[PDB]
Ligand SMILES: NC(=O)c1ccc[n+]([C@@H]2O[C@H](COP(=O)([O-])OP(=O)(O)OC[C@H]3O[C@@H](n4cnc5c(N)ncnc54)[C@H](O)[C@@H]3O)[C@@H](O)[C@H]2O)c1
Ligand SMILES: NC(=O)c1ccc[n+]([C@@H]2O[C@H](COP(=O)([O-])OP(=O)(O)OC[C@H]3O[C@@H](n4cnc5c(N)ncnc54)[C@H](O)[C@@H]3O)[C@@H](O)[C@H]2O)c1
Ligand SMILES: NC(=O)c1ccc[n+]([C@@H]2O[C@H](COP(=O)([O-])OP(=O)(O)OC[C@H]3O[C@@H](n4cnc5c(N)ncnc54)[C@H](O)[C@@H]3O)[C@@H](O)[C@H]2O)c1
Ligand SMILES: NC(=O)c1ccc[n+]([C@@H]2O[C@H](COP(=O)([O-])OP(=O)(O)OC[C@H]3O[C@@H](n4cnc5c(N)ncnc54)[C@H](O)[C@@H]3O)[C@@H](O)[C@H]2O)c1
Ligand SMILES: [Mg+2]
Ligand SMILES: [Mg+2]
Ligand SMILES: [Mg+2]
Ligand SMILES: [Mg+2]
Ligand SMILES: [Mg+2]
Ligand SMILES: [Mg+2]
Ligand SMILES: [Mg+2]
């Protein structure tokens with residue numbers, strides 16, 4: 001067990017990669033604070049953990065709303081006493097729209113969740129971790145934190161922004177035993193790709209050196225490692241889980 | 249002259265690097281649309297250009313307000329009939345504040361100007377440039393688009409985000425005649441930086457391979473070059489003007 | 497155990513980070529082919545592994561000599577029948593010498609070990625891994641694969657080169673079952689670093705966000721993870737273990 | 745004129761990008777020291793410059809041979825008194841060969857020219873520039889200094905290595921007024937691409953945001969700028985001339 005006895009929160013844990021991160025955290029021995037904007041989905045992630053013998057609670061949170069983060073931290077402390085680990089996973093792609101046609105609402109929504117929501121979490125999580133001598137934060141960026149994806153300017157800007165705040169937080173709090181890193185997945189087998197035509201899927205696959213898409217477990221395994229004491233000299237860094245996407 | 253006959257707008261052109269960019273554009277033969285949130289400083293820049301016999305106008309714009317971009321584009325068209333070049337320079341540092349103490353207002357203000365305001369300008373600028381066959385955009389990022397600077401998480405996130413939206417836009421519009429790049433200055437002798445105490449200056453200098461701070465002309469020269477047809481195979485890229493800051 | 501039943505070779509395994517990698521591989525269940533240019537140090541590593549009941553052999557290899565790689569591969573096959581994992585760790589710093597004073601012999605020696613020797617190993621390792629369906633390679637680069645360190649131009653060039661050949665190999669062999677990644681440590685407490693004067697240690701520490709140097713286990717843990725099937729979507733990439741060094 | 749009165753040497757100036765760099769340097773007012781391994785080609789570059797009214801000399805040099813660099817520097821001083829600018833352009837692609845099948849000779853030849861030859865030049869050029877208070881060096885890397893190109897592991901390793909030694913030299917000599925930068929072209933219209941089928945050319949073109957290949961002048965224009973006093977705060981940096989290749 002990588003994470004025995006540690007307390008870990010996951011944002012956007014109701015579905016997709018976040019669900020798998022929460023399950024992996026629990027399987028590694030962590031006490032998990034499941035959160036999502038969807039209580040139905042988040043509740044089911046909680047029930048999944050509990051039915052597998054893990055220790056967890058659920059707390060609602062819209063990561064775009066600063067006040068929700070306070071409630072996360074309070075839930076963590078109430079259930080488990082401290083916060084050791086946090087994964088800022090909640091995020092959306094946005095619609096595919098060329099920049100010149102991207103509306104203010106499109107821009108604002110994606111930045112608000114994917115960038116501001118990460119900042120508001122990280123801010124609250126630092127404060128909680130300082131109470132008890134540090135901790136580990138993992139932000140879910142993307143390949144789009146290092147390269148551009150056409151049609152999703154807001155997403156690319158946000159995901160680059162996540163990479164940047166990781167760097168600054170690492171220096172501000174490394175003295176105090178907070179580690180923070182980003183993870184950059186390439187295309188992962190989640191709902192969006194599941195619903196494109198095979199031909200499109202094959203074109204995405206050929207953009208990876210492994211010539212296939214990733215699975216959510218492949219992302220979660222790296223998040224778990226980075227959240228663990230094995231990763232004790234790793235901070236301020238971007239860790240790809242990209243199947244070689246960025247290498248060409 | 250690098251830019252003879254071209255029409256260029258500059259945001260944040262009332263002082264600092266933007267003023268020098270505007271001056272440089274005019275000295276290279278461009279018609280200049282000077283804009284700033286401070287109409288006094290913007291009018292000053294205009295006066296400096298006109299005093300040398302350059303062709304320019306001033307138009308107010310707060311880059312954080314989408315509607316002001318439409319008035320910028322309209323001012324360019326009214327004055328000079330087209331838009332060929334745009335430099336998204338307006339930006340603020342924020343106050344130095346550790347992430348855990350950074351307020352919502354601090355985060356939102358810096359993102360709104362330094363990231364959203366760049367997006368809103370780029371969006372307007374693309375649309376205008378496409379009317380007449382394309383053009384060149386230069387976004388002013390920072391070293392903080394590549395590394396972190398303690399105390400300015402908002403700034404770092406924003407400046408990374410600027411790097412990212414440069415990449416997408418370049419691919420979306422590269423076959424349509426629009427080039428876009430980002431410039432990353434290190435510490436530059438604007439009024440504020442000029443006036444730091446000597447012991448602070450020396451501390452900053454030692455962070456640069458050249459063991460000195462930069463001058464606004466040193467930034468503006470690169471911006472001018474990137475805005476010119478000499479730079480016809482240059483797009484989607486980040487150009488440091490950093491005195492070696494990033495190289496260690 | 498991360499690596500149960502796998503056969504792993506380590507270059508430069510007689511001391512320092514390589515010794516710890518070898519130990520870690522064995523503790524994670526791998527059969528280990530320990531190799532080094534120093535047969536005494538290599539035999540010591542072997543003894544440490546065997547003393548705990550691990551399965552291992554020693555084979556001499558100077559990584560700069562192509563033919564020694566063939567004997568490594570042959571030793572793996574003879575002992576354990578296949579090769580699943582390889583870590584190209586052997587490396588030297590060179591002496592600190594400004595570029596203008598660096599001799600041909602200094603340049604050639606460091607490139608020969610740290611760059612050519614990595615290539616010669618990777619080449620042999622690919623061929624062997626392909627016999628049995630693929631495998632995982634980890635190259636030890638450095639922070640000096642991403643930034644420069646004054647006085648060690650040869651080292652910096654070599655370590656950048658290691659980063660680059662990781663990328664090509666990942667694409668060439670990613671559909672054939674071979675993953676390859678590079679690891680970038682900052683300053684680590686090997687024997688030499690352990691023994692620097694306190695005022696030098698403190699100067700180095702301040703270059704890391706964690707305000708301390710790393711331990712060999714902190715490197716080895718990442719190498720083990722990257723060598724395992726948990727890392728199945730990770731290829732072509734650079735993984736810092738740098739305590740935040742690169743983030744400023 | 746960007747370079748009036750400065751003395752500039754170019755390696756590999758007999759053909760391709762290097763020829764165009766030498767011509768551009770001369771057109772910008774520099775005194776040019778043309779060098780190549782091919783005296784026939786280099787002599788013709790000299791005659792081209794002279795027939796256009798420029799000032800230049802030719803000196804043979806195989807960049808792989810350290811002693812040849814001494815002869816370059818001596819030629820520069822003999823003709824023109826000092827060395828202000830140097831462009832380390834000479835380079836080869838190598839054959840396209842998967843890593844596992846790349847021979848020692850292939851590896852050694854490409855590293856010897858593209859990496860060691862750059863080091864030997866830079867070493868000699870620093871020494872000469874220090875005599876007269878500094879100067880500017882431009883190394884020609886590639887997109888393959890930042891990403892991998894299948895089939896050319898040696899080339900990718902070398903071109904990454906060039907990026908690295910740029911960083912270290914910038915810090916070692918920035919105090920002393922030596923600037924050094926790398927340039928990274930994507931696919932440029934030179935002999936190789938001229939001889940592939942259209943279909944292949946179109947596939948390469950689609951890898952660039954501009955959806956076309958670069959021209960040698962587009963590279964030379966950036967080299968000229970970086971070699972000039974306009975670029976006085978630019979050091980230690982990688983400058984793409986990639987048509988957006990790296991942005992995806
Ligand atoms: N799927 C991919 O290929 C991929 C690749 C790279 C990065 N990512 C990133 O991975 C993370 C997880 O996304 P996913 O792909 O698993 O998506 P998903 O759509 O399957 O799941 C997203 C989860 O986040 C929740 N959510 C959405 N908005 C929220 C908000 N405002 N507050 C709280 N929860 C919210 C959803 O309800 C859902 O449970 C995101 O940051 C995404 O950008 C995904
Ligand atoms: N000075 C440095 O060391 C440095 C280093 C790296 C990057 N930069 C960047 O350079 C750019 C210019 O900064 P500077 O240092 O010259 O600053 P400055 O403070 O000297 O000038 C900024 C100008 O922008 C204007 N401005 C501020 N907010 C604006 C808004 N909302 N809309 C329009 N105009 C606005 C100001 O009124 C002023 O004229 C910024 O993007 C900054 O982040 C500066
Ligand atoms: N120690 C650090 O701070 C640090 C930081 C970043 C990267 N690295 C890298 O870590 C790797 C290991 O270095 P270390 O610090 O543990 O060094 P070390 O000097 O402690 O151990 C190096 C080992 O490699 C062996 N070796 C040397 N030349 C060899 C050759 N030609 N062939 C085979 N074996 C050879 C030595 O005999 C020794 O056992 C190197 O690639 C180094 O560049 C080290
Ligand atoms: N052509 C491209 O698409 C491209 C793209 C990226 C980078 N590059 C780089 O641009 C530089 C110039 O190459 P090019 O494409 O113009 O090639 P080219 O083959 O047209 O010209 C190369 C020149 O270098 C000379 N040369 C070769 N080996 C030499 C040696 N050992 N010493 C001295 N001179 C030598 C040749 O005789 C020739 O004049 C090289 O570093 C290359 O790697 C080229
Ligand atoms: Mg359901
Ligand atoms: Mg408390
Ligand atoms: Mg990193
Ligand atoms: Mg740095
Ligand atoms: Mg001919
Ligand atoms: Mg002299
Ligand atoms: Mg750079």
Ligand SMILES: [Mg+2]
Nearest residue numbers: 246248990992
């Ligand atoms: Mg790419």
